[PDB]
Amino acid sequence: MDVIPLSLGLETMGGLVEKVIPRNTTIPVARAQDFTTFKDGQTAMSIHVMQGERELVQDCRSLARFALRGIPALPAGGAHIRVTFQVDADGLLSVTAMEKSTGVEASIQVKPSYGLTDSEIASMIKDSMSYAEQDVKARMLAEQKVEAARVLESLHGALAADAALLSAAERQVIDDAAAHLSEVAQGDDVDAIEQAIKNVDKQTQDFAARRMDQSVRRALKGHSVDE
Amino acid sequence: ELPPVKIHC
């Protein structure tokens, strides 16, 4: 039987490619992987199907893109999505995204079309070893950038909810730490991004504790129509 | 629209 010549996967946050069906898998085949949202109330997700062996989007081949829409609005990381890749015996590729609680789904089918040459396939395979270490470093960088954005999004939500728990003075220390994280996350030093996240965490520890204290006093001792 | 985030390891 025939096999898939290159890995098939999906773009994930940070410009990275997650492999769903590995290179050299016999066809027909189907494999799934599970994913979630990045922001509070997210109702859509972009499903960008790629082909190749390397870690960054710019180093793989873009096959197709579509969106899953109608995701129920839930806190960041709360909606559960499964994406399934199917390649039939004739090489037809179907990709389906579906959300757990409502079953909402979107799918495409992509006809086999103008191939890769055997020599371009070989070259993409060989580049993946030749740039393996650079790619490991690039993925680590990008994953730290995603973590930075994750921390910033969570702070952004907490400020939206609970700005009233901070003085303008305390709020400026936080805003300055968050602006500085946001700046260094634009560069290419992984250790610096890590230290800036740690600084945001330390500057928000009291805020996070006042938010818990508030939920606990309220649940346990009760609410006041005052505030 | 945002791409997916891995839901686990």
Curated annotation (Swiss-Prot), chain A:
Induction: By cold shock.
Function of the molecule: Chaperone involved in the maturation of iron-sulfur cluster-containing proteins. Has a low intrinsic ATPase activity which is markedly stimulated by HscB. Involved in the maturation of IscU.
Family per record: Belongs to the heat shock protein 70 family.
UniProt protein name: Chaperone protein HscA
Organism: Escherichia coli (strain K12)
Name of encoding gene: hscA
Residues of the whole record sequence present: 389 to 615 of 616
